Every structure is written in structure tokens, then in C-alpha cells.
Amino acid sequence: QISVRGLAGVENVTELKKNFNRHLHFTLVKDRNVATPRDYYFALAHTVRDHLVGRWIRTQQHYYEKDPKRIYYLSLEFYMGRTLQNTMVNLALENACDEATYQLGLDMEELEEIEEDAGLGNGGLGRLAACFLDSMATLGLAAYGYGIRYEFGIFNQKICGGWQMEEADDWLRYGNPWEKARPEFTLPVHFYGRVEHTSQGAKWVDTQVVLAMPYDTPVPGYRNNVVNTMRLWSAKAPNDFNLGYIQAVLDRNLAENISRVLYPNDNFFEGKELRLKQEYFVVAATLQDIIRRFKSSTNFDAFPDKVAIQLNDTHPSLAIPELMRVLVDLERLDWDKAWEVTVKTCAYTNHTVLPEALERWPVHLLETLLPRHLQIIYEINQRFLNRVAAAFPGDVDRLRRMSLVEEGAVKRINMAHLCIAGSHAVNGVARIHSEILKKTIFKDFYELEPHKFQNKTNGITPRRWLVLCNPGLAEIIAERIGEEYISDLDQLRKLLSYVDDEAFIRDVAKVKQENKLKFAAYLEREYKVHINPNSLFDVQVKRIHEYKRQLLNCLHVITLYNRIKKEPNKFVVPRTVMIGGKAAPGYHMAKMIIKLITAIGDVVNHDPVVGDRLRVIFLENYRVSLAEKVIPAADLSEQISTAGTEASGTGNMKFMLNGALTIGTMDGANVEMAEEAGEENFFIFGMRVEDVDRLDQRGYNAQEYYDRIPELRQIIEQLSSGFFSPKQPDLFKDIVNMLMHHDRFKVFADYEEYVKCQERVSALYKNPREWTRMVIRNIATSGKFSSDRTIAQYAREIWGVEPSRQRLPA
């Protein structure tokens, strides 16, 4: 039907239909009289999976003949979402499958909705690892993602009486057609034990053993016939485990618990033993697999020429002392040579400067769990601090700031300091975030080794985040400029010549309106919720966290409502304010923010005086597949973190690519986006990083703002006196207290500029044609934010390998 969806050849369509019927019979053991839509989903998934396999085997065979340098991306998170449509997109099968299933009397979109998300991540750091895998495959790199196959991913969020409830995300319940278990490549991982010193060096003994069993999932490049591997480890007890006979068998659960469940905190460190086991487990299994693959290519000098390991934040930072352990204890390399190899192999990406998000593990934990790694870490530390001492003689304070060991209450290991010492490259994830690292938290390290520090601004894949979720837009774009932009997103610049083209203006706006109607209807079907699709769709979707300032958005919504109640018969641009995202289970403030949002909707949505001029909707269970629906439907993207706190953001990029305009602070990647599109085509407001620093030197006093802004004082008194909670007038006193006395994120300080910037958005929205022309200028300069650009810079500037756009043979 639409051209970017590929060819529906007579031969291909006939083949698909017969393979579909074959899997329904032989794989699912069903016939058409008894098959449910779920059976039909599976028959289609197995049919599409069959097309991957030849390419998968051929790709891994090619890497074996050519022996290129291999890239290993280690992450505790891979937030993959659904796989069926993505695989059709990259194989150019979408129109053929659509034709084939329509001929069998099925609606392929209905079947797509049955697939569970693979929710193996929390938010932007896990989704970044997913876009990156897609980009590495599209650029033909010999790349493997390594992680943990969690049996339960991020929880499903239900809202009850306006509060978040969590329920287990049992995503494997019906099976997962995309993974292949590889029980034959199972590997042991050791925990506890003790260290013995021999004349022959150290030996780690009396350990408990857990087995790591791999499951491989294919990752197709965009039409290049490349299929790389995502290898995820599952924990298994050994068979003589303990071996009541009955209790000994039931206790095998203790081992297997390692891979049971994703820790749901995001941008917040919890120093729990089970989380540390998961970190060491992924690292110990992955490095044996790497060294094995390297040996089947004695001489470890060539290791860094044949291997790169990229650490996704500090979560796999144990790779560094584990590599040393293997090289020194097992392979008997001397320390200095082992260290040289390690540093040249590893690189570290940082994704935060929030102090609560930094991993600092108690020494007593590492001592019991990983006694040999703590000894290695002490030694790394001693030699590193001898280099600091030589470079800055007498600077005893620098010695204590830079140490890997933090002195104090409980001694801890600063995992970020360890990564910087044992990596040849450290990067931040947006230009302002990388500059902040050099000037504040890693300033001492930068002074020591300036050449290690780099920037790699984040990106998103344009396959998932345009072609897949917004085919209407990808299509009016390809009509004018062809299809090559899908893997060369810079070509979108050519659209700047269409900014005054009347046909284009109208098509861009027609596509948005269609996305809006489709999403308005999804809301009613799947949630009985009623919206005006003519309203401006004002959307803030991301994890709930105080730094993201969903609370500033709430204050704006209450101001708009109060203004209406004051002058009811005045005209206002109608809005649908949608806010969604999950809160970590013990992050009390974040759960209270969810409750506030729904409590506002309760008042605002049933006030007859408002009518349909204002609606506040909490979008439940926000996750990758929900992103794919709401993002194409949005007009306005809320990116309103306090300057200096959103390291990059990526949701911001998705919205820009999909024809929403952005209201935001000069934070993270928002700075580079404004610079690409021009500041006149973005709605920037609020303190810059400099302004935040100046307010901190003086002292932030929220009372000052409350005293000087009568619209703000009114909202606070409404919150305090029970206006939004009539049956429990003091429900929101923790929120008021925090805003009044300990707001780390200065919500009041940005309030006036934010409300005034929102009036400018409403003014532009009144003029459809100039709103759309500014939209065009955003889409057209979104090219820099493709993850293919990001990954080509990692390849060239960190990994030392060349991307490639050439097809492997079909």
C-alpha cells in the first residue's frame, strides 16, 4: 500500500502464505477452527523469523572468515520493546506480510498488538543500548550486545484510586519466538570463596558456582542482510547443587534468582547484594565467552586489536578487575602487561552527574562476595595513586579525592573512578554533559589524563522511531526526497527547500492530524478516555523523577485551570495535557507526584465550566510500544529538567523527528537540538547551568518566589488546603513541604519564565500554517540525532574500526 513498506511480489506473497499455514499446523499444532488471534501472531512471527536465519548464519560465518575487530557492548539493560514489525521493516517484508495476512483474512496490525514488549530496561539508558544495537548492525560492525535475560522485566503499572500499583511483567509466559537457547555454550561463574597465595601466585578457592546459560536473539541491520547477536545470560544451578533431598532440589532457586528480575530504580543507586551478583554474573560469563572467541581466532598483545569492550555506565565496571584477574591469575601474564591490555580494551560511558545515581559499593560486600576482585582493586588504586603523587607532588587532597576507595562511615569503592583508571576513553553523552564532567565531578582526572575525555552525543534509530512508528510521515518525506534518508538521516536537510511549499505544508499537517485521531481512538478503545483531537497535544513522557520536574508541568496545568475559572468566557487554545511514566516502587516522592497528577485530572476533567478546553490525562504503563503510539501524535514535547541534570535525553530526539515542537531548558541534548534547528524554532526558557550555580552560591529560597508571585501562592494554598484532595485535606503536604523547604531542583525559580513561554506556544498554535513551517524546520534539522551518526563516531574515535554500508549477499 505505501512505498517505504517495500514490494508485495506475487511469488513472495504466495510463499509467506504457505509458510504461515505450515507453522500454524506443525509448530502451533492448531487448525483454523480453533486458532485464536494469539496463535495467528505466533504463526506470523515464526514465518518472519525463518527469513532471518539464513542471514544470521551467513553473517556469523563471514565474521569468522574475515576475523574483524569485535565490539562488545556490556549493559545491564536492553530495552528492546516489540520485535515483529522491526524485523519486517529491516528485511523489507512489511507490505508482503501485510498482503499475505490480508489474503488469509487477517489484520496484521491487530496481530502486532499481541506481542509482549521485551521490557528489559528502565528508561533512556536501556533504550540507548537498543538503538545502538540496531545502528551497529546497519553499519556492518561485528558487534555483540551482552546482558542478562531477566525472567521479569520492568513492572506493569496499573493506576488504582489514582495511585501506582505494580504487577509482575511475566513477558515469557507464552514463549519468546525470537530467542534461541544455547545450553551447549554454558559457562561457570564463581561467588564467595577465599584467596590462597601460593608460590605460583594467587588462587581463588572454595567458591560457590552458578552456571550462565546463553540465549541468542538476532538483530537485523536495515536492508543490508547483516544479522548480529544479542546474547543474554540466564542463571542455572549446577546438578550436584547442595547435592531433605526435597529441600536441596527446591533450594536450586537460590542460584537461579540472579536472573529473575530487573531492579526497577532508574537514576538512583540501591546498594543491594543481589544487584551486585547480577553485575558480576553478566561480566564473568561475557569475558570467558570473549576470551574463548579470541583464542579460536597465547598472545594477548593482539587482544586490544581484536577486542573492544564498551561499558554502559559503571554497571559492568567489574569487567576491569575481572579482566585483570583472568590475565594475571589464569593466564600468568605479569601485572604491567595485563594492565596495558585492559586499558586498551575497555572504554566507559557515563550517563549521569546526579550524586544519588553514582554506584559506590561497600567494601564489606565486595570482601565477602568477590574477595579476589577487592584485592585487585586495592592494587589498581595503589598504582594509580602513585602516578597522581608523581604528577602533583604534595597535593594530598587530590590523593584523597581521586582514590577509588572512599574513606568514611563505611568504606566504599567509587566505581566511576575505577572505570576512568582502567579505560583508554571516557565519554559523556551530550556536549554540555561532557563539559560538565571535565569541570566538576571528573575534573581531577581530566587534569591527569586530558586525552581520555570525549563527547559522543546520543541519538535514536530512525527505523523504529520514524519508519516503524510513523509510516505516514516517512512516506510524504520519501515522495519528495527518496528513501535513502532512512540510513543517512542528514539528508532530511533537503526538506528545508519545502518550507514554503504549499502541498508539503498541508501533507505534514494532514499526517499529524491522522496520528492524533488514531491515538484519540486508541485511548477510548483500550481505556474509555475521551479527548478533543482538535486540542494541542501537550505531552511529557519519561520516568518520574524530581529532576525531570513533572511538578513544574503540574503547576502550569493548575495556572491554566485557575485562569479559566477566573475568566471563563475568554478564549484559550484548548489543550490535552498528557503525562506518563513509571515511578520506582520505594521512591515515595515520585509516587506522590503520580497521585497529584491524577488528582488534578479528577478536578479539571469534571468541571463543566472548563468544558473541553483543558484535559489532564495520566498515561498508564508507559513503555516502548506506548512511546511508538503517543510520540507521532504529539504537538508539544516537554523537556523541562533543571539545567545541568538531564545528561542528554533521547525522548527529546524522538519528538523532534516526529513533528512536535519542543518547550525546554538549555539542558542535555536540548542545547544541540536548538542549535541545529535555530533557537527561533524552539521554545527555550529558564535558568542556564550558570544561573543555577549562581543561585546555589547565594542560597535558594523558595519563599521569595511564593512571596512575589500571586498566581504561584494561590496554587500552593490550593494544594495545602485540600482543594485537590477534599476527603483528605492534607494528602499533599509532603509535596508542599519539599517545594517550600528542600527543593534540590528549583521548581519555583523557573516558574514565571515557563508560564510565559507556554503563552508563546499557544499563540503560535493559533496560526496552523506557521506552526507547521516551524515543525518542518525541526524535522529537517533532526539528522544529527540519528544513532548511526553516534555509532560511526564511537567506531572511529574509540573502537578503531570503520563503518560499512555494503550489503552482504542475500
Next chain:
Amino acid sequence: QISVRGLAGVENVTELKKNFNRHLHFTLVKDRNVATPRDYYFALAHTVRDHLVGRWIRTQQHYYEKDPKRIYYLSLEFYMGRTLQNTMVNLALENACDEATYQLGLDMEELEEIEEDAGLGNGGLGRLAACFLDSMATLGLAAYGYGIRYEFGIFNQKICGGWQMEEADDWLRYGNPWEKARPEFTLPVHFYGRVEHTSQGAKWVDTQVVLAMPYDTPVPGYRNNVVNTMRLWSAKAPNDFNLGYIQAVLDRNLAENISRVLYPNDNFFEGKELRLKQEYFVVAATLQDIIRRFKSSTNFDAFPDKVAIQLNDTHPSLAIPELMRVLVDLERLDWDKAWEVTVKTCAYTNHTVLPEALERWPVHLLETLLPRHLQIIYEINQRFLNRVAAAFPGDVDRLRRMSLVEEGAVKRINMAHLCIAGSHAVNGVARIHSEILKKTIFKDFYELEPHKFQNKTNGITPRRWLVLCNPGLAEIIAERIGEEYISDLDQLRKLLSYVDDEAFIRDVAKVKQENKLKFAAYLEREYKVHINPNSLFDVQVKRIHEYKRQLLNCLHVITLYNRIKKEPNKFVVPRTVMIGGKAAPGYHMAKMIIKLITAIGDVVNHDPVVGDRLRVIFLENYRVSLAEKVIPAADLSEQISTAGTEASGTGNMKFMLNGALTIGTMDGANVEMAEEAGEENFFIFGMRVEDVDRLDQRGYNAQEYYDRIPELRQIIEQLSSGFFSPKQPDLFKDIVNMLMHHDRFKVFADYEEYVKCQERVSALYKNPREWTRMVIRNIATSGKFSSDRTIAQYAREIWGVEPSRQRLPA
């Protein structure tokens, strides 16, 4: 190659090869350069499985159109062994697969050895359920076996320093190609809670819920295109389970533990809570599935016309009060009508008279776990005892003997009494065992309801237990009489006309010698063990239990050794004495017996004076696939339980069918076997049941035998003084003590007749031609012991349905 293995058609062979290559590529995602023999096994299994599926769908469709009465066989055990060769046998695919794999350069026998046994049973009661499923399918009955999918089956037994060690049987580790998960038919099962009485009757509330998820395994009939279903339940937590968030997710293991592991006690009751949960779980899930299937055929009068439920011992006896619960509480039938339906639906098979093997559950357990079922059981009891009182007025002792509630220390429920009250038919499993039930433990019930009591002598399937494991013998038989005997085992009688036929005599003995060489070599390959294949293969294989009297066998072995040491230069018929079987983990006496056996082998096998005239081998890890190898190789079958204690035995039947002669007591089915072949063609010795009773009245005094039999006293002094345990002279004092002071099974009493009967066996073995003619007379009268005969009598005499040998269309 051999004719009972079917046709190797050019078309069929070409098809198999291409389907094999297809599964290797698309299913296993491998190519020939990297595939291991395990990959090859799986590609062949998937290829054979594909031939089942059309027949499976067609069979279940046929039962839906025809609506026959359905038979439900409820067992906690299905001891299935391997499936690949069995499926080839019943589909007539064996020679074609053999040809196909040979053409691909593979040895199909080597691939067969890779498959794990499905070890979902302990011994004869679980294996009986497996032979029965095969027979129900071959006779075309609409039959479903229902059980539990244990994640760990019976443990793997290793021997270390002569002691049994147990290790977990992780049989699912590589996946199971034969099962299909059916997550869409998942059902809730309730535990704990409390009972509320309403005006509308009773209600069971505040329960914890566990989900039962079914996995279906196909069960092919012998060349009739029938494929029935074995449906096994797996335990799953619900998703809001509890729902630390992390602890709540990890605690889902508590629910799932129900289906984790098979209880490894056999013929011994352990009253553990987890075992009771497993019993109720299988029963509650199965009956909802039955009632569902019955409704999709309001009027429960026709329920017994459309449903039979067969209870395999008392393990699923909760079916009776669960059926009442459903009918009374949920369907609102009145009690009397519900009771009529129940009794007409259920039938109970007993498999023991050992008091330690009878289930008697503590009331306090049922009270907490299943409060409504205990109330139902009290009510059943009260009404049943009102009928006893009316029939035997004033007989207060009869009232207390017959009650379902046993008074005492802890009140218990006698589950056997409940089964008899709520079933229309009770059967024992061999004629002497059924007579014993009527005369001793169920005598009171028989007097009340004589018409309930029946016999159904056990049998074994001739597909697994002749065609599959002994193709050489099935082939020389089919040459003379054709192939029809495979599903009409009575036809073996025709072989009696070949008893003096010289060609036949020689072929029967050639087949045995070949089985013996093949097994001698298996011992060296897989176990470095060295045997004389010219020796008489004297084999005792079965679970270790005092009633089976592996100890009597040991005494005979020590007597033979002592006789050799006394007259070393005398001629003796050389023997290989093989004993194997598993001991339950806390059955201390049984583990000591294993240690004794290996300790005897240690002495006997390295005494140079013995040479290779005597060898004692402990066969490790005895299980269905090991049975299939040793049984065709045996000359002499040891069936030596104390008269009145082996309810039937089935291993005895396997050996008879495979050309071993039997030495045995007049116990269980041995009585009917001797009667079929003629007593002159069996080696019967020892007390009859009558002799055992007479000795019990007088009092058994083992000292008397020790005092009067100098060969027996010598063995005892050897045991006591440390002859078989030099480094720990008192290792065996518990065994001596038991034999001397508390032998429930009278091992000494049968000792003299046993040793003398063994001299007669050795005398016959000296004359190959008359040994073989007596072999022929055994094989030829083994027909009655086919499970098709057993199942045709259940069908006609209990279930009220007619067997059928007709093919469904291909």
C-alpha cells in the same frame, strides 16, 4: 534392514532427509559444520514429531464429532522413558529414518542415546501408567492421562565408594521436543482459606490461588493413526502474587514449587505437606478440565455415561470429595444426586497391602490446607457408617474398623477407605493380590459391597518391551508367524509348534547370545566393566526395598563364593550376578543393602581363585532406558519377594517375554505366569502365602535357621566379623541385627529352598538345548501379560466401553 521395522520407500526416505535438513537450519539454527550429535538428535526428533501432528489433530477432531465416553487416567506418576524410537515404532517409520540418517552419514542408534528419559515415576506403579497409555491408544479408546509435569524427575544415582549418591535429574535442560505448552488453557487451583455458610449453602473463601498450566504430549497407538493426549500440569504464580517489590517477585517460587520435584519414595508413605499440595493440584486442575470438556459436548445425570475417572492408587483420591465439592457447592446439585454421579464416575485401583505404603493423612493438615474437603469427608463418613450400622446392627467394632477417620495419637483419614466408599469398582492387580484384599485389609468392605471388588491382572506393552528393545527376537518370531502378534500377543501360542524345530531352537539361542555380547560391550564402553558373555546372566533389577529381598540374593551369591573357596578345582556353571535399582534417600536399610552389594563385588571380583567363574555387578542408575538394554540380555530373572508382598510385579513379565527363565516365589503375577507356562517350566521355591501366615501365628525366630544351617551361620559370621569391610569391621551390624532380630520379610526362612532351586537352574543351564526349549515354552505362553488384554478388561468390566482395532484414516 529387518522386516518388523517397516518399509524404506524411496519417496519417504527423500522426504525425511529434506525435513531433517530443514529443521537443522530453521529450527536449530545450525549448519553441518558446527552441528553436534545433540543437534542431530533434535533435528531427527522434530522430523518425526511432524508426522504425529496431523494424526493428533485428526484424532481429537474425531472424538469431538463422535462424542464417545472419555476415559481419564489420573496418576501422580508417568514413567515414560524415551519417546523417539517408540514413536518411530508406532508410526512404522523406523527403517525409513534409519535409511535417511545413514544417507546423511549418521548412525541413528547413536542419536537415540542422546534423548533424556522422561523419568516422571519411581518404579512399577509409574511404568504401569505408561504401558496403559500405549494400550489405550492402540485399542482406540478416547483416553487422556493427567499428571504433573515435574521439573525434576526421579534422581540420577551415582555410586561413590560403593554408596548411592543422588543428583538432580534436570531432564528439561535442553528442551523437550515432544510437549506442547498450552498457556491458553490455564486454570486456577485454591489452597487454605476458610468455609462460610450462607443461606445459599457453603462457600470456600480467602484462598490462595496457584495457576495450573497444561503441557500436552502425544501418545501414538500402534499403526492405527490414533494419537491420544497426555496432559501434565505445571504450577505458575498469578501476576499480582503478593503484589520489597524484589522479594515479592522472588517469592513467586513458593507457588511454583508445587510442580518442582517428584517425591522419590516408592511403596512407602511420607505424610509431607508439599506432597499433599501436589495431589490436590493435579486433581483440582484435571476435574475442571473434565467438566469443561463435558459441558462443551446442565444435566449431570449423563456425566457417568460420558466420563470415567480411574484412580491410580489413592494418590488422586481427593478427586472424590473435589467432585462432590464442585457438584454440591458450585453446581447446586443436592447431595444424594451428586453422590450417585460420583460413585458411578470413579473407580480405584489398589497396588499394595504393605501397611507402610498406605496413605493416611493427618486431619490437621487437611483442616488447614483443604478445610472444605475435610467437611465433605466427614459427611461422606457419617452417611457411609449409617449404611454399615443398618447392614450389621450392633457391630460397633466393624464401625470403628471401617470408618474413614482413624482415631488415635493424631486423627488421620484413611484414603483407601474413602476410595472404596466413593467408587463403583475396586480392583487389585493380580489374582492372588485381589483375593488377599477380599480376605484381609478390605474384608469388611467386601462383606458390605461384594459386587465392587474385581481383579485386573497387570500387563506390559509388547511394543516397548519386545519390538523396540528386542528387534532380533521380534524378527525370528515374525518370520514364522507373521506380524499380527504385536497387537494380539495371544498369537505367540502358535510358537508352541516350534519347540522341537531345530532351526528355531538355534535362532532363539543366537538372538540371546547377540543381546548378551551387545550388553557386555555396553558395560565396558560406558562403565569400564569386564564380563564373561558365556556366563549365565542372573539379574535382579527393581527398586531396593526389604520386601523384594535383594538380601536373599546376596546370601546366595556369598554361598556360591564360599563353595568355590572350599573346592576351588571343582566345576561350576559361571555366573554374572547383576543387581540394580534405586533406594529412596532416607530409607537407611535400603542404602545399606546397596553398600553390601558393592562390597561383595569388591571381594568376589578380585579373588584370583574365582577367576571369571563369578562376577557381582551393581547396575548403576537403573531406569526405563537401562531396562531396555539389560532385560533382552538376561538368562535368569530374580522375582523373590516374600509371598503376599509383591502385589503383581511387571518387570517379571518383561523378562518372560524376552527369553529369560524365572526363579521366583508364588507371589503376585508369578502365580499366573507359572500357571500359563506350566510349573515344570518355572523355578518356583519357598513359602506360599499360607506358610507365611502359619509362621506368623507361631512366631518367626531367625535364630533357629542360623542354628540349623552351617552355610548360613558362616555367612553371618563373615558379615559380622568384617570379612566384607576390613577397614570398618562393624559396617554391616545393622543388617545382621535386622536379619537376626526383626526381619519382617523372613529372609532366612526361604534360604535353603532358594539355594537348592538355584542348583537346579545351574543344572539346566549346562544343557543349552533344553534350557532353550523351556525358554520357548515361556515366550510362547507370555501372551496373557500384554497390557492390551489388561486394558480391554478395564474397558469392558469397569469403564463400559468397547475397544476397537480399526484404523482412523491416514
